[PDB]
């Protein structure tokens, strides 16, 4: 019962993994992540104010 694994999971996707997804995605999981990132950037801006 030996299952081959990687020593560590992939840190990031390859080049081109994300940018076209961001502007074409209909995946609610990715959209939720995008919401969280952008809302937190706005939180930092409002906190600086």
């Amino acid at each position: 019962e030996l299952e081959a694994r990687r020593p560590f999971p992939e840190r990031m996707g390859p080049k081109g993994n994300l940018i076209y997804k961001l502007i074409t995605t209909t995946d609610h999981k990715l959209i939720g992540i995008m919401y969280c990132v952008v809302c937190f950037a706005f939180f930092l801006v409002g906190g600086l104010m």
Binding site: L2, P7, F8
Partner: protein
Amino acid sequence: DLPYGSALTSSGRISAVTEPGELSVHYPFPTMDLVVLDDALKYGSRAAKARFAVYIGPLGADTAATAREILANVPTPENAVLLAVSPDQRAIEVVYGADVKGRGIESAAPLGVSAAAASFKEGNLIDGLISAVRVMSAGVSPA
């Protein structure tokens, strides 16, 4: 026979859990060393178009028949190059499939054994694995 909190689902997948604050993986090596070994494996395999694999564990008494048994667990094993190590028995084995024969592995596999053994005598297990993978993949051609 399933661990605590693990369940066999209607698809056959296992749905498991971890206690809060505990880890799923727990390999006894630092994260950045694991990342270095993962990169060595990935970019050595890409550069040679042969899947490189590493085994750590008990190799038995013959230790080469056991290593040939373990190579059957690597995906596409005919094109794979496994480096198995027994820290207890202090044994180093390299086993590869038929697709890799004649591509430079007869020269490089003993070099990988030597590279691993040099680092093991300093007590550096993951460093030995990384060095051996680097030398063996640098010596195999995508042929």
